[PDB]
C-alpha cells in the first residue's frame, strides 16, 4: 500500500507537474479522501509538502503559507528543507490578499527569528511595520519570485504591483498632512493622474481617510486638531518624566531612597 | 479583617431569609453598600451604552439592616431602551449567567437591578416604580440602582442612586427631604407623579485590602490622566442640550410671570447656575494646565 | 414528582406536582403556593423557556429538578 | 512587538477574583481567567475579563473548552464588538505549568497574550506583567518561551472618575 502510494505520487507529481496541473489537482482531490489518514514511517513528510505545493499552484496563498509555516516547525525534516519551507511561507504570505489572517500571519513571521536570514526579510518588515517599499526592492522581489506566482491582470496592473502601490499610499497616509499630486506620483513611481485616481478610489471605498482638493491638486489626510494634540503631547511629557524617574531609581537606589525620605521632611 | 465582608455565610443567609424581619417594618433597609468592582463595572457599562439606556443585574447579600452588593453583570436586551424586559432573550440570559457563575465560585445571589438614566437625573419613573413594586412583592429583598453616566462625566462625581419602593396603598408619613435635582421638561410630569412611592437608601462603597494596595500602586502611573483630561471637549452636546432645556424653562417662567410649580424662575436660575459652574470649572482646569506646561519656556 | 422550584433571588419553594401535570398546571400550583398570577411567570428549564402548552414529561420531569422561575409584568 | 493598553477594570477583576477565592478556600490559591479586548492593527487593548473553569489531574491543569465556548457565546451576546485576547493568572515568574496552560490556550487563538498579577509583592511598582509567546530553536530543539511586553494604562473619563472615587472615598464646589 505505502510503496504503491509513494510510486504513484512520485510519477504523478513529476509528469503531472510537467505543466498540466488541472488533472493533478483533480486526481489529488479525489484520492485524498481515501488516502489513509494514518500511515506513519516518514510518509507524513511528503503529503504535507505536496498539499502545500498544490495549494500554492492553485492561486490560494494564505492557506498554503499556513501549511508551510506548520511544516517549518517539524523536528524530523532537515534544517535546509525547513528553511526552504519558511521561505515559501514568507513568499506566499507576502503575495496573499490583504486580510485579518494575513495580518496575523505577517505578525507571526515577524516574531519568528529564522526569517531574519531570509532574502525577503526587508519586505516582510516593511509590510508589517507599514513602511514604503521602493521600486528597487520590488524589482528584486519580482526577480526572486517564480514565474507562475506572477498573476497579472490582462489590462495590466499586476496583482503584486497594485497591492504594493495601495500599501505605499496607505503608509504615506501615516506620514503626510497633505501631499500634492506630483510628489505623490514621484513617491509611488506612477503618473500623477494614476496617483489621483488610485487615491480617490481608496477614499471612496473607505480604506483610507482624506479628501482631494483638485484645484490645488492636493490630497489631505487626517487633521490632528490643536487641543487634542496638546493633550497627547502633555501625556507624552508626563510619560517621559515617569520613565526618567524610574531610570534614576533603578541606578542609584540608596541615593533615591535617601532623597525620597528627605522629601517629606523638607 | 477587611476581607471578612467577602466571606459568604450560606447558613446565616438562609436563616435571615427564613426569619424575614422586613415584613413588620417598612423602612427596614436603610444602608446600601457597594463593592468597588461592582461600581466600576456599572459605571463603565452605563458609559459604553452611550446616549441610550442599558440595564443589568446585581448580585449580593444582606447583613441585618444593610444591603451589600458584590457583583454586577450586564444582560444584552440589545439595549436601545426597549419596551421593557425581553423577547425572552434576557429571560434566558439571567438564569444562564447565574448558573454558569455558580459552578465557578460566584456563589452569591441576586439582590437588585440597575439601569442608566443618561442626562436626566437619578430617579424611578412610573414603569420603574411598577417594576420594583412587582419584584419586591414576590422576591425579597431587591433594590433598584440608577446611574447617570453623562452627569458623572460633567460634574466629576458619580451620580448613583439606590432606591426601594413602598407597598401598594401605603402612605408614608411625611419626612421628605427632597433635595433638588435638575430634570428636563419632557420628563418632569412622571417625576412629579411618582415621587412618594419610593425612598432612597444611603449608599456607601467598600473595597478589599488587595484592591486598596493595587489602587495606591496604580495612582503613581494614573496621575497623568488627571493632568491631561480636557473635560471641556468631551461634553459639548450635553451642554447644548442643557442650554436648550434651560431656554424652554425660561420661556415657561416668563409665561407664568405674564399669566395670573411655584416660582419656576428660581428653578431656571438654579439650572443655569449649575450649567455655568460646570463650564467655568472646565475652563479653569485648562487655564491651570496652560500655566503649568505652556509658560515654562525653557 | 415533587420538585423544589428556585427563583433568581434565591428563594426555593417545596411544591407537590404530579408527573402527568402540564406546565400551566405547575404555573397555577405556584400561583396557589405563593400568589404570583399565571401571566407574570416564566419558567426556564435547562436554559430553556418552555412553550407552555407542551405538556411536561416530554421536556423531562426526572423527579427533583429545579425549574428556574423569572417574573414578568405582562403589559403593565 | 505590539503596543498593549491595559484597563484598571481588568486588574480589579483579577484582584477581586483572588481575594474571593482565598476567603472561600481559607488558604491562598492561584486562579486562571480569560481576557477580552480589541486589536486594531498592532495596537492591542484589553477592556474586561471573565473567569475560566479549570481542573487538575496529577500535576497538569486542563481548561474546560465547553465552558469556555458557552462563556464566549454569552459575552458575545452582550459585548458584540469585543473578542478574546489571552489569559491571566496570579503568581510570580512564569512556570512550566504556565507554559503548559499557554500551549493549551494556543489551540484557540493564534497568539494569545498572558497576564500575570502578583498579590504578594514587596516592590514599589505595579505587579502586573504582560507576556507573549515566542517559539525558538535552542541547541537544535524547538521550545516556546515568553517575551515581556510594555503596557500603558488606557484613558477613559468614566474609568478615571470611578477609580479616583474608589481610591479616595472621602463645603463648596471650587473646593
Ligand atoms: C429586573 C428587570 C429585568 N425587570 N424586571 C422586571 C419585572 F417584571 F420582574 C421588569 C424589568 C425591566 O426590565 N424593567 C424595565 C422597565 C423599563 C425600562 C425602560 C423603558 O421604559 C424604555 C425607556 C427607557 C427607560 C427609562 N427608565 C426605564 N426605561 C427598562 C430598561 C432600562 C434600560 C435599558 C433597557 C430597558 C427596564
Ligand atoms: Zn428608568
Curated annotation (Swiss-Prot), chain A:
GO terms for molecular function: deNEDDylase activity. Residues 57-226 form the PCI domain. GO terms for biological process: protein deneddylation; protein neddylation; regulation of protein neddylation. Its main location: cytoplasm. It is found in: Cytoplasm; Nucleus; Cytoplasmic vesicle, Secretory vesicle, Synaptic vesicle. The keyword Signal does not apply. Belongs to the CSN4 family. This is COP9 signalosome complex subunit 4. It comes from Homo sapiens. The lineage of its organism: Eukaryota, Metazoa, Chordata, Craniata, Vertebrata. The gene is COPS4. The chain holds residues 141 to 406 of 406 of the full protein.
Curated annotation (Swiss-Prot), chain B:
It is an enzyme of class 3 (hydrolase). The keyword Protease applies. Pfam families: CSN5_C (PF18323), JAB (PF01398). Keywords: Acetylation, Cytoplasm, Cytoplasmic vesicle, Hydrolase, Metal-binding, Metalloprotease, Nucleus, Protease, Signalosome, Synapse, Zinc. One of its GO terms (cellular component) is cytosol. It is found in: Cytoplasm, Cytosol; Nucleus; Cytoplasm, Perinuclear region; Cytoplasmic vesicle, Secretory vesicle, Synaptic vesicle. One of its GO terms (molecular function) is deNEDDylase activity. CDD domains: MPN_RPN11_CSN5. GO terms for biological process: exosomal secretion; negative regulation of apoptotic process; positive regulation of DNA-binding transcription factor activity; positive regulation of transcription by RNA polymerase II; post-translational protein modification; protein deneddylation; protein neddylation; proteolysis. Its EC number is 3.4.-.-. Zn(2+) binds at residues 115, 117, 128. InterPro entries: CSN5_C, JAMM/MPN+_dom, JAMM_MPN+_peptidase_M67A, MPN. Its main location: cytoplasm. Its cofactor is a divalent metal cation. Residues 32-169 form the MPN domain. A motif (JAMM motif) lies at residues 115-128. The keyword Nucleus applies. The JAMM motif is essential for the protease activity of the CSN complex resulting in deneddylation of cullins. It constitutes the catalytic center of the complex. The CSN complex is associated with some 'Lys-63'-specific deubiquitination. Such activity is however not mediated by the core CSN complex but by the BRCC3/BRCC36 component of the BRISC complex. Belongs to the peptidase M67A family. CSN5 subfamily. PANTHER family: EUKARYOTIC TRANSLATION INITIATION FACTOR 3 -RELATED (PTHR10410). This is COP9 signalosome complex subunit 5. The gene is COPS5.
Swiss-Prot record, chain C:
The modification N6-acetyllysine is found at residue 48. The record marks 8, 44 as: Interaction with UBE1C. It is found in: Nucleus. Pfam families: ubiquitin. There is a cross-link at residue 76 (Glycyl lysine isopeptide (Gly-Lys) (interchain with K-? in acceptor proteins)). The modification (Microbial infection) Deamidated glutamine is found at residue 40. It comes from the Eukaryota. Keywords: Acetylation, Isopeptide bond, Nucleus, Ubl conjugation pathway. The keyword Nucleus applies. GO terms for biological process: anatomical structure morphogenesis; modification-dependent protein catabolic process; protein localization; protein modification process; protein neddylation; proteolysis; regulation of postsynapse assembly; regulation of proteolysis. The keyword Transcription does not apply. Highly expressed in heart, skeletal muscle, spleen, thymus, prostate, testis, ovary, colon and leukocytes. One of its GO terms (molecular function) is ubiquitin protein ligase binding. GO terms for cellular component: cytoplasm; cytosol; extracellular exosome; glutamatergic synapse; nucleoplasm; nucleus; postsynapse. Gene3D superfamilies: Phosphatidylinositol 3-kinase Catalytic Subunit, Chain A, domain 1 (3.10.20.90). Cleavage of precursor form by UCHL3 or SENP8 is necessary for function. Residues 70-72 are annotated as: Interaction with UBE1C. Belongs to the ubiquitin family. Interacts with AHR; interaction is direct. Interacts with NUB1; interaction is direct. Interacts with ESR1. This is Ubiquitin-like protein NEDD8. It comes from Homo sapiens (Human).
Curated annotation (Swiss-Prot), chain D:
It is found in: Nucleus; Cytoplasm; Cytoplasm, Perinuclear region. GO terms for biological process: protein deneddylation; protein neddylation; regulation of protein neddylation. It comes from the Eukaryota. Keywords: Cytoplasm, Host-virus interaction, Nucleus, Signalosome. Residues 4-137 form the MPN domain. GO terms for cellular component: COP9 signalosome; cytoplasm; cytosol; nucleoplasm; nucleus; perinuclear region of cytoplasm. Widely expressed. Component of the CSN complex, composed of COPS1/GPS1, COPS2, COPS3, COPS4, COPS5, COPS6, COPS7 (COPS7A or COPS7B), COPS8 and COPS9 isoform 1. In the complex, it probably interacts directly with COPS2, COPS4, COPS5, COPS7 (COPS7A or COPS7B) and COPS9 isoform 1. Interacts with the translation initiation factor EIF3S6. Interacts weakly with RBX1. Directly interacts with COP1 and 14-3-3 protein sigma/SFN. Interacts with ERCC6. Belongs to the peptidase M67A family. CSN6 subfamily. This is COP9 signalosome complex subunit 6. It comes from Homo sapiens. The gene is COPS6. The chain holds residues 38 to 218 of 327 of the full protein.
